[PDB]
DNA sequence: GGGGGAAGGATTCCG
DNA sequence: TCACGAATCCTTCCCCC
């Protein structure tokens, strides 16, 4: 089986460059302004120019401005990036029936039946890159391998504006050389757990008793890592369906005052329903981010769909539950709808 | 003993 | 300040035969 993974380069910022080309060549920072003060918030992403100086996704906007005071700072316009993405996804859909859109700027294509060997795979990769650049003026990076995980790793190694193939022979090498922390799904928490067990590479997962691994990182993560280490991981490319829709907003100031919090909560509900469109959820969860940036939530699943009036009513009750069961002040408040009919 | 579900949270980083 | 949306999985609790 041959998998071709496509990941768009510094996506949000590149889209802003496409819409305003005079931005090209200069540091561009797309920001998420939270409203607590002047430039409160964090960076969603920055172009490679800005990243050379340490400005990238996740850092505080104020910290980015200390480093690059003259960069161009733009507010994130997700709806715009989403429409551009969809167009790109429709182009890729032209190169394969088996396609998995993994996110706003990532997709996996099973090109096994329309290509022989990695030579043709590579060539199809170039045609894809070129097609997207000519049609949308968007550069992307392509990764190709025997399964989804190595196709993604391949792209990560080839970024930006690249293309790379990880053949059956390199897979074997990577299993031995690749820091296990570099494997998708292995975050900081899991990587530390694995280090303690003496697992530094995928290979290491083969000489440890499974029950021991499972006990430390969970059955699912253990079976996942072992399958990869055995060169046996082979998850099919399939359509992904959205399972939940929600919105969470930052309040000007922290609070525990119901009447002060409600307006934010209600705006979150209105936007969430607009997003749901025709989907009707049976579950609602109120999510709160506390002053110490901890996350707490309380939800309820109904035996039927939730009307907006029901959502307003139930949300207030769930919020009251949070306030009653957690003494901390609330900093961010929101809702999430799931279990669609 | 174990088959669901549901609730709240841990992790991930797919953003 | 993780200074800002969504999926999978895990633990615990609960109902039931
Ligand atoms: N709000 C927010 N958005 C993010 C964050 N990380 C990524 N995004 C958004 C903007 C990114 O352009 C988009 C795609 O994420 P990617 O991880 O693929 O990074 P990008 O595409 O920005 O850079 P890349 O060339 O792939 O290294 O998702 C984040 O931490 N917060
Ligand atoms: Ca990307
Ligand atoms: Ca991506
Ligand atoms: Ca990692
Ligand atoms: Ca990322």
The answer to whether position A212 is within a domain reads yes
Residues A122 and A145 in one domain: yes
Which helix (H) or strand (E) segment holds residue A285: the answer is: strand A281-290
Residues A248 and A332 in one domain: yes
Q: Let me know: does A185 contact A217? Beta carbons within 8 Å.
A: no
Task: State yes or no: cis peptide before A160, omega within 30 of 0.
Answer: yes
The answer to whether position A238 is within a domain reads no
Q: Which two tokens stand for residue A115?
A: 């290509």
Dmax over Cα atoms in chain A, in whole Å? 64
Nearest to A230 by CA among A157, A146, A155: A146
Q: Let me know: does A134 contact A12? Beta carbons within 8 Å.
A: no
Q: Let me know: does A32 contact A59? Beta carbons within 8 Å.
A: no
- Residue A202, class by beta-carbon neighbours within 10 Å (0-12 exposed, 13-18 middle, 19+ buried)? buried
- Distance of CA A191 from the midpoint of ligand 4 (Å): 7
CA distances from A256 to A192, A289, A317, A333 (A): 36, 12, 14, 11
Nearest to A155 by CA among A14, A6, A2, A48: A6
Sheet of A3-8, strand order: A99-103, A106-110, A3-8, A140-145, A163-165
CA atoms of A43 and A58, how far apart (whole Å) = 5
CA distances from A94 to A88, A89, A124, A131, A139 (A): 10, 9, 12, 11, 18
CA dihedral A315, A319, A325, A330 (to 10 degrees): 150
CA of A62 to C1' of C1 (A): 12
Nearest to A118 by CA among A142, A98, A85, A99: A142
Q: Let me know: does A312 contact A337? Beta carbons within 8 Å.
A: no
CA distances from A33 to A42, A68, A282 (A): 7, 17, 32
Task: Specify the resolution in Å.
Answer: 1.9
Tell me which residues have their CB below 7 A from strand B: A 57-58, 102-106, 184-191, 283, 285, 295-301, 321, 339
Pick the catalytic residue: A106, A232, A259, A271?
A: A106
Residues A326 and A187 in one domain: no
Q: Let me know: does A153 contact A165? Beta carbons within 8 Å.
A: no
CA distances from A299 to A317, A319, A324, A328 (A): 10, 9, 14, 19
- Residue A43 pairs in a beta bridge with A31
Ligand nearest to the CA of A43: 1
Residues A52 and A153 in one domain: no
Write the DSSP assignment of A112-160 as a string of letters: GGG--HHHHHHHHHHHHHHHHHHHH---EEEEEESSHHHHHHHHHHH-S
Where b means 16+ CB within 10 Å and e means fewer, A278-294 reads: eeebbebbbbbbbeeee
CA atoms of A205 and A224, how far apart (whole Å) = 10
By C1' distance from the Cα of A332, the closest nucleotide is C4
Q: For ligand 1, what atom is nearest to the CA of residue A48?
A: 25
Where b means 16+ CB within 10 Å and e means fewer, A98-118 reads: bbbbbeebbbbbbbbebbeeb
The contacts of residue A326 (CB under 8 Å, 6+ apart) are A288, A290, A296
Q: Which two tokens stand for residue A125?
A: 């990769």
Host domain of residue A260: 244-336
CA atoms of A228 and A205, how far apart (whole Å) = 9
The single residue listed with the structure tokens 């970024």 is A159
A281-290 and A140-145 beta bridge pairing: unpaired
Q: What is the CATH number of the domain that holds A315?
A: 3.30.1490.100
Which helix (H) or strand (E) segment holds residue A103: the answer is: strand A99-103
Experimentally determined by: X-ray
The answer to whether position A63 is within a domain reads yes
A330-340 and A99-103 beta bridge pairing: unpaired
Residues A254 and A313 in one domain: yes
CA atoms of A13 and A330, how far apart (whole Å) = 32
The answer to whether position A293 is within a domain reads yes
Residues A162 and A172 in one domain: no
Report the first-to-last Cα separation within chain A, whole angstroms.
35
Residue A25 φ/ψ region, left for φ over 0, alpha for ψ in the -120 to 50 degree band, beta for the rest = left
Residues A160 and A97 in one domain: yes
Q: What is the CATH number of the domain that holds A19?
A: 3.40.1170.60
CA atoms of A248 and A325, how far apart (whole Å) = 20
φ, ψ (nearest 5 deg) of residue A287 = -120, 130
CA dihedral A210, A216, A219, A224 (to 10 degrees): -80
The single residue listed with the structure tokens 């082979």 is A234
Q: What is the number of helices (H) and of strands (E) in chain A?
A: 12, 12
CA atoms of A91 and A93, how far apart (whole Å) = 5
Residues A6 and A149 in one domain: yes
- Residue A144 pairs in a beta bridge with A4, A165
The answer to whether position A341 is within a domain reads no
Residues A88 and A111 in one domain: yes
Residues A330 and A256 in one domain: yes
Residues A6 and A95 in one domain: yes
HSE (side-chain half, CA atoms, 13 Å) at A258? 10
- Total count of domains within chain A: 4
| Residue where a domain stops, chosen among A233, A262, A290 | A233
Where b means 16+ CB within 10 Å and e means fewer, A255-272 reads: beeeeebeebbbebbebb
- Say whether the CB atom of A220 is under 7 angstroms from strand C: yes
The DSSP secondary-structure symbol of A54 reads T
- Distance of CA A184 from the midpoint of ligand 4 (Å): 7
């Amino acid at each position: 089986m041959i998998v071709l993974f496509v990941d768009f380069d510094y996506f949000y910022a590149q889209v802003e460059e496409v819409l305003n080309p005079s931005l090209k060549g200069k540091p561009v920072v797309v920001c998420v302004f939270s409203g607590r003060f002047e430039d409160s918030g964090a960076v969603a992403t920055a172009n490679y120019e800005a990243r050379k100086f340490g400005v990238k996704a996740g850092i505080p906007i104020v910290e980015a401005k200390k480093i690059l005071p003259n960069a161009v700072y733009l507010p994130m316009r997700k709806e715009v990036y989403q429409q551009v993405s969809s167009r790109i996804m429709n182009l890729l859909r032209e190169y394969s029936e088996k396609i998995e859109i993994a996110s706003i700027d990532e997709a996996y294509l099973d090109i096994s039946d329309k290509v022989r060997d990695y030579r043709e795979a590579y060539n199809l990769g170039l045609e894809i890159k070129n097609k997207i650049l000519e049609k949308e003026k968007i550069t992307v990076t392509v990764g190709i391998s025997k399964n989804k995980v190595f196709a993604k790793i391949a792209a990560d190694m080839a970024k930006p504006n690249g293309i790379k193939v990880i053949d059956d022979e390199e897979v074997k090498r990577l299993i031995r050389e690749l820091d296990i922390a570099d494997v998708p799904g292995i975050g900081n928490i899991t990587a530390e757990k694995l280090k303690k067990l003496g697992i530094n590479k995928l290979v290491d997962t083969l000489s440890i008793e499974f029950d021991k691994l499972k006990g430390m990182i969970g059955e699912a993560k253990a079976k996942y890592l072992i399958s990869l280490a055995r060169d046996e991981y082979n998850e099919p490319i399939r359509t992904r369906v959205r399972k939940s829709i929600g919105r969470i907003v930052t309040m000007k100031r922290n609070s525990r005052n119901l009447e002060e919090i409600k307006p934010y909560l209600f705006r979150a509900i209105e936007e969430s329903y607009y997003k749901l469109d025709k989907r009707i959820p049976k579950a609602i969860h109120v999510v709160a981010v506390t002053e110490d940036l901890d996350i707490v939530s309380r939800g309820r699943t109904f035996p039927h769909g939730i009307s907006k009036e029901t959502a307003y009513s139930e949300s207030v009750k769930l919020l009251q539950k949070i306030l009653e069961e957690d003494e901390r002040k609330i900093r961010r408040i929101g809702v999430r709808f799931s279990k669609f009919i």
